[PDB]
Design a binder for this molecule. Structure first.
Ligand SMILES: [Ca+2]
Ligand SMILES: [Ca+2]
Length: 165
């Protein structure tokens, strides 16, 4: 609690045109890693366009951290094949959370992160103040695989008793 800024909600929305790692399909799930934390979504059966809509919750004590996202094909009785990976920075979002935004009109775009050679963004990622919440919408193009994107949204949970932002 004495280092905790808050909890980062990562909503893993969907995968789009993921790689085939069975015969004609895959059984994808996502593993999210940050620091010593490792979280997993459920498996979606036989769908390379899986709609996970699954909330993962990480503890954040460090605005300078990176989130790693790796997709795998679940094979019940054998090894799980890699289906690509991506990473993103949380600093822009944490920075934005620390701004004065009570008073900003809903729909206000606080920060835009551009795709670059180094990052995994498939398109510009907006940090938006909307419906009284700050969110970041991400489309991640997966590395180290022949196709696939993962769409995710960042949200924030304040934990009373913590260090806070
Ligand atoms: Ca397989
Ligand atoms: Ca499989």
């Amino acid at each position: 609690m004495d280092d905790l800024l808050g909890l980062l909600r990562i909503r893993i929305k969907r995968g789009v045109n993921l790689a085939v790692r069975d015969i004609s399909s895959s059984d994808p799930y996502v593993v999210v890693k940050m620091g010593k934390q490792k979280l997993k979504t459920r498996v979606i059966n036989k769908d390379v366009n899986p709609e996970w809509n699954e909330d993962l919750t990480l503890s954040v004590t460090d605005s300078n951290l990176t989130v790693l996202l790796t997709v795998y094909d679940h094979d019940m009785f054998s090894k799980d094949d890699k289906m690509g990976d991506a990473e993103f920075e949380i600093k822009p979002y944490i920075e934005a959370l620390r701004m004065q935004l009570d008073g900003l009109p809903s729909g206000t775009i606080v920060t835009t992160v551009k795709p670059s050679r180094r990052n995994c963004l498939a398109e510009e990622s907006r940090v938006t103040w909307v419906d009284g919440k700050l969110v970041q919408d991400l489309v991640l193009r997966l590395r180290h695989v022949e196709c696939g994107e993962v769409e995710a949204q960042l949200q924030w949970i304040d934990l009373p008793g913590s260090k806070g932002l």
